[PDB]
């Protein structure tokens, strides 16, 4: 955590179903957007942290 990792996602098509419906992801809570509105929208400047 002190030396965490960041990733830049660019030039892809977003499909959250494969990840929403996977077993280990028992927690999916979002802030600025509804959890089920992801597939209805386009994105730019997408980054992730691990």
């Amino acid at each position: 955590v002190y030396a965490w990792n960041r990733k830049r996602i660019s030039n892809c098509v977003a499909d959250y179903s494969v990840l929403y419906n996977l077993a280990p992801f028992f927690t999916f809570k979002c802030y600025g957007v509804s959890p089920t509105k992801l597939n209805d929208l386009c994105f730019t400047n997408v980054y992730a942290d691990s």
């Binding site: 996602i9 660019s10 030039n11 892809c12 098509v13 977003a14 499909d15 959250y16 600025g32 957007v33 992801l38 597939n39 209805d40 929208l41 386009c42 994105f43 730019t44 400047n45 997408v46 980054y47 992730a48 942290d49 691990s50």
Partner: protein, 49 residues
């Protein structure tokens, strides 16, 4: 694993976004179609519904 839950390691991933305020690149599973000229329609335009 001898520690109780609440001490087990939990993998955390957070996602950052900017909403529509730039040319969108990453998109969802929507399928495009040809536009129209001078006809009253409704559009999506990368999210501008």
């Amino acid at each position: 694993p001898t520690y109780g839950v609440g001490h087990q390691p939990y993998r955390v991933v957070v996602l950052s976004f900017e909403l529509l305020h730039a040319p969108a690149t990453v998109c969802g599973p929507k399928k495009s179609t040809n536009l129209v000229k001078n006809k009253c329609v409704n559009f999506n335009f990368n999210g501008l519904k």
